[PDB]
Design a protein around this ligand. Structure first.
Ligand SMILES: Cc1cc2nc3c(=O)[nH]c(=O)nc-3n(C[C@H](O)[C@H](O)[C@H](O)COP(=O)(O)OP(=O)(O)OC[C@H]3O[C@@H](n4cnc5c(N)ncnc54)[C@H](O)[C@@H]3O)c2cc1C
Ligand SMILES: Cc1cc2nc3c(=O)[nH]c(=O)nc-3n(C[C@H](O)[C@H](O)[C@H](O)COP(=O)(O)OP(=O)(O)OC[C@H]3O[C@@H](n4cnc5c(N)ncnc54)[C@H](O)[C@@H]3O)c2cc1C
Ligand SMILES: Cc1cc2nc3c(=O)[nH]c(=O)nc-3n(C[C@@H](O)[C@H](O)[C@@H](O)COP(=O)(O)O)c2cc1C
Ligand SMILES: Cc1cc2nc3c(=O)[nH]c(=O)nc-3n(C[C@@H](O)[C@H](O)[C@@H](O)COP(=O)(O)O)c2cc1C
Ligand code: FES
Ligand code: FES
Lengths: 309, 261, 309, 261
């Protein structure tokens, strides 16, 4: 790549800011067939859970206006397989591609187990805590909806992680600011947001929800305005960097993420529509930067950070 | 290059009640070889981001074309919008995709049974055109709900060494009823069975030929990425405890029973 | 109209379930030029505030994928003008069109003043409480985000209203269920939902938010899955009827609203794209009902209500 | 009927740097009479629900057509998608809309000043074609950023009793600079001034002809409904305290100063 597109984030020395979002790129195996994965800034692989999980019953996806619903349920082969097979494959084939590991679980003990082990992977440069999961201990309340509960989790995971810890925020809250400050106070090195919103679709013939799980996560361009709003809200009072995502589909969206306060950008759902979306965004970024008087993403970050109040 | 392409619509005509036949022309037809692979077509509407998986019914090498038969929904569906495409229009396509039917793995002396139903029938056409170039017996058991929906009869009967029977639930045309009734008769000891149709019919077939080794079933699933990354289109391998099968990569076609790869 | 499309809700005897949403139809004046307003089931007119309001600075609208952002700020001529001019115009021209009055305010005292007076309008058959407003008394916290605060407001307004009171719920909450139960316990006759979500769009050339107000309300088909989810969640534990809205654009959407639990459906943003959207939906509803084995909306409501658990 | 229609594109050609001229044919052209009214066009993309307000540059009664000149943005804008429309394509249109220019309210002996800039220039064309059928002096002061953007010069100069001057900021072609420089010269005591251009230029004009009664300004605003219901496109009437003016209904054109109806 080139200097204009490079960003340095804790644990992440990215050649460009484009990172496929967790759950939308598997472990890179399938999309490697399409293009040289080395073209990417990094990759957020799908969630790893202490134990393997089959996931939810089908159907698991549904289409919405400019978005999609999914209720995959975090299917993954488990930590063991991931440590011995999935991660090694990426390191063996793309030694230099830094990968961000997404971590999920049903209770604090599960997150802790994964965080403590996954950092041993030579290629894993940072951890992304998926806190949108139901806390079985707290009746089923997502860790990402209570500031003190999220904070407790981040601290515990921080004490045991060997790489930087990024926490992915949920947009399904009344006020995201308290959760963000709390997580920052707990030791997080950065934040990523947003995970999906919640939606439902009904089948008119059957009169039943299309998804077997009833509710699903809503993603795609439809949610970009929400992502931009929350990112922007959080950037105003946090000193750690943010990796933004939610509805990014082109270089213009990426640049808009920067205007809101993001330091890097992840692309999820768009990969399903166009598997070459990331490389195209990467190639088009400079033309667009030229057009808007941006010397480099690095300079843009500081300009946006100082034009505050 | 070889994975995605803006194909050209050669023609598109409604061949049955809300069932269209689209002939596409493009280099992608070159990679084609196995019957049962599918294409992932993009809808010409920005608010519909997911591609529709449509099996390949047939292709013409020398002409560089492929044909797909697909049913459409109401004005709010993506297929409805595809059916509006005129000659010359470009269709953003992904494919060929999936594990096709195994044809290059069998004799010129075996009894072949091909059973299909409704929109599961089209991929079965290329399968017959492929088995023909080789040699032996074939008895195509096609099933439809009504004659209004009956498709491909001319091309199947226009095949040599092919015996064809058509069943119809209500709107009767051939032997009234479901293909199951047609299964009861078949005396010949078949060696291979290829299938593609409704989940109900697939249950009936697998059940009847419970231990037939060469029992091939083409499945359907709500899909997204279509390449194996997302895990949307998942199924259970040999019973619950085992491995998970992705219909878009491991399939569309799987080996015997309620699921084996 | 015809029997198949009729619905009886508290204070509302609707010829069909189609109602233009508040803020998207003015006071009926402009759209009357386009078609006979009598074709509609009812009309939710724009918010009335005790005092007239100019609203927010411009720009006030922005486009998003399958939706739009608006930051109008509830501009209205005030109660007086509304009582003497706007409402009388509708009664004089459409004596039989029952209208739903949307009420807004910055504090409890404002809501109370409007609720107590607006019911004197012969044509006003129900009140819709817009609770997504910032409570100046509680630091700026929207009344719709705290169950006890919303409940206090509903009770006060109920004690003074001469027509049924419908409360419009905000989707911008962590858990909508407690707010819904609380409002029902306080005396509300029904509920309408959802109001808009929050979004932001940035202008790449200026690097500033497109809207002068920065954040805006997000509406349109993009949000239908969210509306459907919340409506469905709330229908499971409330005994009062719900008028649904959020992304409805055609008869199929309307029917989907019914499957989730709505008793009637309001259409907002779609009017801007196609001013004849409501009449078209009304004409197409029966074909669609035929296709899906629905004798009448009234029967559909009971079928959906009993297919619970 | 008379408010919305699926018009036909007669032709569309790029007449300047990213500036297109679209000729539309339809019955709606019948309701047209005042210069300065606009159309609300729908984008052929389902994810873009808001219609784009584009002033009418001119129309041909006998031919039943109307012409619009509009600038396009990048591949993610709605206008870009409009510019892709070929002959025969249908454009969902709303209009005529708004309060046009008052032409049928003045003499054959007055001095008329018409000032325009960039994309504000097109509606000014029909205005001249309307004032011509009547009679007196007209001095069109057109302003552009560069020659690359200069539009309509032939048609304006092809008008009788019309004196035309062209200014250009950088990419010089006529008198270098902004139209303001051109205002300084004009000796004749004008009786009416019609304007349409950038907010900056409108400020300059109103300021110079501070008390000119017949001072007409065509405004621009982010709009939604385009009919007056939403209140998106709002402006202040005679100072802050007064009534609010909607650019889509009360305007596009308003009377003198920073705003009066
Ligand atoms: C491997 C495979 C091959 C197929 N081959 C054919 C074929 O050759 N001919 C044919 O007519 N049909 C085929 N189908 C079924 C066809 O994909 C669906 O009928 C079609 O995608 C429904 O899209 P829609 O345009 O109606 O959109 P909508 O109803 O608007 O729905 C939008 C989303 O729902 C998905 N969806 C809705 N219903 C189905 C369904 N029943 N199955 C799968 N996805 C669904 C759409 O694909 C899309 O992502 C195949 C399905 C699969 C999985
Ligand atoms: C009454 C009126 C008449 C106009 N007449 C003309 C004309 O004759 N020729 C011409 O070239 N332009 C005209 N414009 C400006 C033109 O409407 C905008 O340049 C155009 O709508 C921007 O749309 P977009 O395709 O770029 O979409 P996008 O940039 O994607 O934006 C989508 C939304 O932003 C709105 N929007 C964005 N920028 C503007 C802007 N500067 N002004 C208004 N809306 C905006 C769009 O209309 C739309 O609703 C007029 C504007 C108004 C209010
Ligand atoms: C199919 C699918 C599966 C996902 N799985 C995860 C996951 O494993 N972990 C996680 O943190 N996020 C998951 N995400 C959510 C995000 O990666 C992401 O926040 C996103 O959906 C919002 O961005 P997008 O609009 O670009 O998809 C998933 C999203 C999709 C569409
Ligand atoms: C321009 C605009 C103004 C609105 N003003 C109000 C209002 O006055 N009061 C209120 O309760 N809702 C208001 N709404 C919000 C809703 O009426 C409605 O809940 C809606 O936006 C969701 O439905 P839709 O997707 O069909 O617009 C407004 C929405 C829009 C688009
Ligand atoms: S469609 Fe994504 S794994 Fe099959
Ligand atoms: S665009 Fe809605 S009132 Fe002007």
């Amino acid at each position: 790549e080139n200097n204009r597109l490079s960003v340095k984030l804790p644990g992440l020395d990215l050649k460009n800011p484009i990172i496929p979002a967790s759950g939308c790129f598997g472990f890179g195996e399938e999309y490697a067939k399409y293009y040289d994965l080395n073209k990417l800034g990094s990759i957020m692989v799908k969630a790893t859970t202490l134990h393997p999980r089959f996931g939810n019953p089908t159907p698991r996806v549904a289409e919405t206006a400019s978005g999609m619903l999914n209720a995959i349920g975090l299917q993954n082969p488990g930590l063991e397989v991931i440590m011995t097979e999935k991660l090694p494959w990426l390191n063996e084939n793309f030694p230099e591609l830094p990968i961000i590991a997404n971590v999920a679980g049903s209770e604090e003990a599960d997150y802790v187990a994964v965080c403590a082990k996954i950092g041993d992977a030579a290629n894993v440069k940072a951890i992304e805590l998926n806190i949108s999961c139901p806390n079985v201990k707290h009746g089923g309340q997502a860790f990402g909806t209570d500031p003190e509960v999220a904070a407790a989790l981040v601290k515990a995971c921080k004490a045991v992680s060997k790489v930087p810890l990024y926490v992915k925020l949920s947009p399904n809250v009344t006020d995201i600011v308290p959760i963000a400050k709390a997580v920052e106070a707990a030791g997080a090195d950065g934040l990523t947001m947003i995970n999906t919103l919640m939606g439902v679709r009904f089948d008119l013939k059957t009169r039943q929800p299309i998804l077997a799980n009833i509710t699903g996560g809503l993603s795609g361009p439809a949610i970009k305005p929400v992502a931009l709003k929350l990112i922007h809200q959080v950037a105003q009072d946090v000193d750690i960097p943010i990796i933004g995502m939610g509805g990014v589909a082109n270089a213009q969206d990426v640049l808009e993420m920067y205007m809101a306060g993001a330091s890097a950008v992840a692309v999820g759902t768009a990969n399903f529509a166009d598997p070459f979306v990331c490389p195209k965004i990467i190639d088009k970024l400079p033309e667009l930067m030229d057009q808007y008087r941006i010397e480099s993403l690095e300079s843009l970050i500081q300009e946006v950070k100082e034009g505050k109040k | 290059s070889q994975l995605q392409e803006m194909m050209t619509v050669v023609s598109q005509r409604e061949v049955a009640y809300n069932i269209f036949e689209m002939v596409l022309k493009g280099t992608l037809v070159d990679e084609m070889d196995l019957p049962g692979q599918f294409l992932h077509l993009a809808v010409p509407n920005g608010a519909m981001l997911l591609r529709r998986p449509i099996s390949i019914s047939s292709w013409d090498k020398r002409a560089k074309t492929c044909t797909i038969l697909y049913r459409i929904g109401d004005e709010t569906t993506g297929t409805y919008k595809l059916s509006k495409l005129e000659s010359g229009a470009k269709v953003d396509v992904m494919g060929p995709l999936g594990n096709g039917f195994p044809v290059a793995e069998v004799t010129s002396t075996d009894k072949i049974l091909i059973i299909g139903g409704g929109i599961g029938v089209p991929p079965l056409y290329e399968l017959a055109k492929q088995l023909e170039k080789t040699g032996c017996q074939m008895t195509i058991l096609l099933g439809f709900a009504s004659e209004n929906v009956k498709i491909l009869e001319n091309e199947f009967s226009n095949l040599k060494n092919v015996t064809l029977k058509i069943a119809t639930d209500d709107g009767s045309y051939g032997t009234k009823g479901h293909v199951g009734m047609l299964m009861n008769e078949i005396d010949f000891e078949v060696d291979a069975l290829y299938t593609c149709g409704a989940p109900a019919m697939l249950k009936a077939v697998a059940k009847k030929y419970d231990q037939l080794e060469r029992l091939y079933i083409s499945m359907e699933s709500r899909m997204a990425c279509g390449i194996g990354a997302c895990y949307a289109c998942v199924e259970h391998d040999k019973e619950d405890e085992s491995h998970a099968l992705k219909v878009c990569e491991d399939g569309p076609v799987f080996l015997g029973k309620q699921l084996s790869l």
